[PDB]
Design a protein around this motif. Structure first.
Motif: not given
Ligand SMILES: [Zn+2]
Lengths: 37, 103, 262, 125, 46
Positions: C147-164
């Motif tokens: 679930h950590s790997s999947a959440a990571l792989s979701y946050l990676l495909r997100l638009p760049f911002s300092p929080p993400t």
């Protein structure tokens, strides 16, 4: 507390605005309260 | 056939009287029966405020103020004239109210 | 529409749950997880006007008694709401400790948390405060490698911002066993920031990248230097050449060079 | 019935990828309680468990199975523990040792649906 | 394993739309627990 600056003190709890006197004096002009006399 | 009463409240008399004279002349120039813009007393809301901010020096006092003016005009017109006039007359600073009943 | 019995009983229980601080929760509030429609019933109790205590305890109860999709619906429609509401409406813009421990009780089910809390948060105006706070939540809680790997792989495909990038940094500091596809998404993320000279760039190519991006790149290159191919390592050492840091750039390059391809 | 190597390996990889889907019951007790509630969609029993008592109780419900009770046998204990995340965790470079399980239930399939359908339908013969 | 869960993380709104399209049911009292209104009556009598 004063819904602006984390202050338990100074509260104008009247009319449901709940701003302490210091912040309410600043926001007075944006609220509608202006200096006449 | 609707007999409606309108009430305005505003702090700036220029915008309030602009809207008032607008509704007056616009209501008579297309033939309606009306009671002219009656003028309620300007209530002056004042707030007493101590001169002393920091506890230095004796206690002397001060005052803040606001002038609130209110008008009202009575009319008789259909539904469409009232809807259109209410949509057209909307202004900032001035607060308009349209009541239909007469009780 | 609901029966008036439900209306009055759960408006009464909804007046109870405004001030409740200890002891046992109402009997009508603990039989809601067992309902086929717990969501029509949980609204009568008025979710936004519970005390922080009832937020924490209802989080415990409903995330420990419902399913994954139901825990997700709950954490999304009530917990995320109350979280953002208490951060936004407070005056030092801080979060209560019971709402917090509740978020920590919603990360026990990481799928429900990520899909229902983190993801609808980051895609709806996630500012620096809510992510300092939710970043603290995720940084404190232990989450399964999948679930950590999947959440990571979701946050990676997100638009760049300092929080993400704070979040991606935090999930990379976990140093778990990611599948080769997660490491692939990492390399693609850290690749998308290089400048293509052949005529194909976005904003990520020339933008100013924080300390957090070079730290996340450093931890990535530290833990997963043996799980990237030669090609992806050349693309990443290229991103080091172009978009490198003064102190971290050489160490990311050194952490990519000291690795064996798969 | 007669167990083949393809069946047992496809089975242990079914436990492996349906383990990730958060849908397993790893142990004698959790799998028997999984079969009492009608939660077991397929049960895996080890052919090398020393004490036969609990098995002599599960082999009385294996020879006479219910309409919602499909079973299937593996070869070893430590390895059926391994594919359930227990026993061992061995990947291309990494290793971690635990102890092996006797029986394991698949409650939620997920990433192995057609595989558990195949495994359950070939045990029908 | 992964290909199963990332299609649920990256497309969680679409999978929520499909789960809420397939598995939505209106409030039915006889389709809850049948000893539930026994608890509505047991709490409302104090
Ligand atoms: Zn203040």
């Amino acid at each position: 507390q004063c819904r602006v600056c984390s202050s338990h003190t100074g509260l104008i709890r009247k009319y449901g605005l709940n701003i302490c006197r210091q912040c309410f004096r600043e926001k007075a002009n944006d609220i509608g309260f202006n200096k006449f006399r | 056939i609707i007999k409606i009463r309108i009430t305005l409240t505003s702090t700036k008399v220029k915008q309030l009287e602009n809207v008032s004279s607008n509704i007056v002349k616009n209501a008579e120039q297309h033939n309606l029966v009306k009671k002219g813009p009656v003028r309620l007393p300007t209530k002056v809301l004042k707030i007493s405020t101590r001169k002393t901010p920091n506890g230095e020096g004796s206690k002397t006092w001060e005052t803040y103020e606001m002038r609130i003016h209110k008008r009202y005009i009575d009319l008789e017109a259909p539904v469409q004239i009232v809807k259109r006039i209410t949509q057209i007359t909307i202004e900032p600073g001035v607060d308009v109210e349209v009541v239909v009943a007469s009780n | 529409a609901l029966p008036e019995k439900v209306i009055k009983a759960y408006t009464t229980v909804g007046s109870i749950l405004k001030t409740w601080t200890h002891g046992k929760l109402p009997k009508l509030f603990k039989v809601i997880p067992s309902l086929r429609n717990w969501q029509d019933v949980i609204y009568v109790t008025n979710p936004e006007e519970w005390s922080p205590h009832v937020v924490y305890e209802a989080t415990k109860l409903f995330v420990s008694n419902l399913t994954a999709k139901e825990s997700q619906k709950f954490i999304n429609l009530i917990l995320l709401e109350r979280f953002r509401d208490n951060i936004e409406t407070s005056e030092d813009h801080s979060l209560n400790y019971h709402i917090y421990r509740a978020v920590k009780k919603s990360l026990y089910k990481p799928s429900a948390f990520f899909k229902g809390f983190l993801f609808p948060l980051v895609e709806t105006g996630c500012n620096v405060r809510e992510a300092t706070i939710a970043g603290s939540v995720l940084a404190k809680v232990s989450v399964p490698a999948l679930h950590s790997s999947a959440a990571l792989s979701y946050l990676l495909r997100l638009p760049f911002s300092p929080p993400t990038t704070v979040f991606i940094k935090i999930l990379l500091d976990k140093k778990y066993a990611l599948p080769y596809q997660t490491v692939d998404d990492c390399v693609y993320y850290f690749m998308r920031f290089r400048i293509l000279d052949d005529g194909s760039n976005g904003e990520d190519a020339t933008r100013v990248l924080p300390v957090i991006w070079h730290k996340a790149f450093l931890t990535f290159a530290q833990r997963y230097k043996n799980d990237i191919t030669q090609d992806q390592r050349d693309f990443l050492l290229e991103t080091v050449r172009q978009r490198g840091h003064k102190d971290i750039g050489p160490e990311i390059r050194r952490e990519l060079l000291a690795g064996a391809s798969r | 019935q007669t167990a083949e190597v393809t069946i047992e390996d496809a089975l242990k990889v079914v436990l492996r990828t349906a383990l990730v889907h958060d849908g397993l019951a790893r142990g004698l007790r959790e799998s028997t309680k999984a079969l009492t509630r009608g939660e077991a969609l397929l049960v895996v029993l080890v052919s090398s468990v020393t004490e036969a008592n609990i098995i002599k109780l599960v082999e009385g419900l294996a020879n006479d199975p219910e309409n919602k009770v499909p079973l299937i046998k593996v070869a070893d204990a430590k390895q059926l523990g391994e594919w359930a995340g227990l026993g061992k965790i061995d990947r291309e470079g990494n290793a971690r040792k635990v102890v092996g399980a006797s029986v394991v239930v698949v409650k939620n399939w997920g990433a192995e649906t057609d595989e558990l359908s195949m495994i359950m339908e070939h045990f029908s013969q | 394993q992964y290909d199963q869960i990332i299609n649920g993380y990256e497309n969680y709104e679409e999978e929520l739309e499909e789960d809420e399209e397939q598995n939505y049911q209106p409030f039915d009292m006889s389709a809850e627990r049948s000893d539930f209104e026994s608890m509505l009556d047991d709490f409302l009598d104090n």
